[PDB]
Amino acid sequence: AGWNVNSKQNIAVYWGQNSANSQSTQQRLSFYCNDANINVIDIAFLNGITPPMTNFANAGDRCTPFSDNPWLLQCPEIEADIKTCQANGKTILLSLGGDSYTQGGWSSTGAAQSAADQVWAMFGPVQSGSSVHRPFGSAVVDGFDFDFEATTNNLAAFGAQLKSRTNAAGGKKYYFSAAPQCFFPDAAVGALINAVPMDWIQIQFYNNPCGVSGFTPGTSTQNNYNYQTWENWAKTSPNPNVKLLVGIPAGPGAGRGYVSGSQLTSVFQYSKGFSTFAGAMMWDMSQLYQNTGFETQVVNALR
């Protein structure tokens, strides 16, 4: 039944950007919704907000741009697949920003609040009184992942307005995650995650010296891998009960600091010792499914 706050074996995986970058490495979203081990999928990315822009790599081939915004896609296959995945018991979030987000956020709190209301009208419940375009039609996401990686002015105000709308909503639970890099504090989402409660934070423990590649097996004194710093911060954050996922590259081509074998098992056994630990995150689905046997290694490390 999707995200499980009481489990230490959650696995969140990004889908949409085809990191593996071959013609066949990213199937449609629902191909990956029969995996008993993957209970959260983040759709990557809404890479523009004001104005809105969607990029789903070659999944875009089965979409049609909206007539008045060529960078915003109408995606009936992703729509159908979100509904299928949710019927199959998966939590499907939309990931906001990503490494190709260049708009730099909003000049005022008011502009950030208006942008949040537009994202909610585009991707949350269908609003009968709204003219906004809906990339996923009558599909409704299960919440939002904040993956901003450059300075994003007034992201805290944007996040607070979107959280206001999800907190007011009926129907189902909406979740909030953020994906800071492991360097502490995080420049891009630091203000957001110090202001707005998250359900979990999926830290990118890669592309940085604090990543899982810097973990020292055989000891619980860790000079580089900084999970402990993140747990200490989490306990006084706006949601003091927020959970952490350990985010890793799903293949050597997915990011710097890929780990496997005993390094991978050991860093997960260390991380499992912490009360905030709730599982793993991986970048990304295309890399994971190409990297034969790697998913089994991660599942076996979390057991």
Author numbering: 19 to 321
Sentences from the paper on this structure:
The endo-chitinase Chit33 from T. harzianum is included in the GH18 family. Chit33 belongs to class III (plant-type) enzymes characterized by the presence of shallow catalytic tunnels and open substrate-binding grooves. Chit33 is folded into a (β/α)8 barrel domain, similarly to family 18 chitinases. The DxDxEx conserved catalytic motif is located at the end of strand β4 of the barrel, with Glu167 being the catalytic acid protonating the glycosidic bond and Asp165 playing a key role in assisting the acetamido group in its nucleophilic attack and stabilizing the developing positive charge on the oxazolinium ion.
To elucidate the molecular basis of its enzymatic activity, the crystal structure of native Chit33 was solved at 1.12 Å resolution. The crystals belong to the P 21 21 21 space group, with one molecule in the asymmetric unit and 50% solvent content within the cell. The structure was determined by means of molecular replacement using the co-ordinates from the Saccharomyces cerevisiae chitinase 1, ScCTS1, as the search model. A short and not well-defined α1, a bent α8, and the presence of two β-strand insertions after β2 are widespread features of other family 18 chitinases. Moreover, the short loops connecting the secondary structure elements are responsible for the definition of a tiny TIM barrel, which diverges from the bacterial-type chitinases embracing large βα loops, which even include a full chitin insertion α/β domain (CID). Furthermore, three disulfide bonds, Cys51-Cys103, Cys81-Cys93 and Cys200-Cys228, are detected in the Chit33 polypeptide chain. In particular, the longer β1α1 loop makes a deeper cavity in Chit33, conferring a more tunnel-like appearance to its active site. A TRIS molecule from the buffer solution was captured at the active site of the native crystals, making polar interactions through its hydroxyl groups with the catalytic Asp165 and Glu167, as well with Gln222 located at the end of β6. As shown in the Chit33-NAG4 complex, Ser118 presents a dual conformation in the free enzyme that is fixed upon ligand binding and orients to make a polar link to O6 from the sugar at subsite −2. Structural comparison of the wild type and the complex with NAG4 Chit33 does not show significant differences, apart from a visible reorganization of the Asp117 and Arg274 side chains that approach the substrate, enabling direct polar links.
